[PDB]
């Protein structure tokens, strides 16, 4: 049996660690909700 525990408020935080890139990927989504790369 699964359960839930509070982890915090949903708020935007200024001065947060800015990381990560913005790639443009060609993808397909199947009937099982799984993404895949198209090339």
């Amino acid at each position: 049996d699964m359960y839930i525990e509070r982890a915090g408020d949903i708020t935007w935080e200024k001065d947060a660690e800015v990381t990560g890139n913005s790639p443009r990927l060609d993808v397909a989504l199947d009937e099982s909700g799984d993404f895949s790369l198209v090339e």
């Binding site: 359960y3 935007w12 990381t19 990560g20 443009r24 909700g33």
Partner: protein
């Protein structure tokens, strides 16, 4: 039980110890998470019980106690914040500019941040604090890293 708005960890005692299987958002008395986290199973909140209300395997989303309430959308150009809630670790905001998943049915935003599978359901936010989608469903690029889609439901 506890229905206060906020981000929650989805835990299980089925495996060894207590294992975090995912994360979810509580908003307007409805718990929102990804389908692959719970598989549509009932959840527990202290003594209370949360029953599934709506779900879909293709969208990879499920709502508890009521219909999906999250309807904010990415604007196509601004930076967003992933409010990542990792297993055994404190909730943490990571600002990023999302990329694009191009599909046969249109374009979806995509955050390129790598987190453990138990982080699935962590909400992606806009500058107003509104939940624009959930992190946890995407693809594994040539690098071995994970790039998640910004998965958003539909508000009836």
């Amino acid at each position: 039980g506890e229905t206060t708005d906020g981000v929650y960890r989805v835990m299980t005692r089925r495996l060894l110890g207590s294992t975090q299987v995912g994360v979810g958002v509580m908003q307007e008395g409805v718990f929102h998470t990804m389908w692959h986290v719970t598989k549509g199973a009932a959840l527990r909140s202290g003594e209370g019980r949360l029953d599934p209300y709506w779900g879909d395997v293709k969208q990879d989303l499920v709502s508890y106690c009521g219909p999906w309430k999250l309807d904010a959308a990415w604007d196509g150009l601004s930076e967003v914040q992933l409010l990542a809630v990792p297993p055994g670790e404190r909730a943490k905001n990571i600002q990023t500019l999302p990329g694009i998943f191009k599909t046969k049915d249109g374009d979806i935003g995509a955050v390129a941040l790598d987190y453990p599978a138990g982080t699935s359901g962590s909400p992606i936010l806009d500058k107003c604090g509104r939940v624009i989608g959930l992190y946890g469903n995407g693809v594994v690029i040539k690098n071995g890293s994970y790039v998640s889609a910004i998965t958003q439901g539909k508000r009836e």
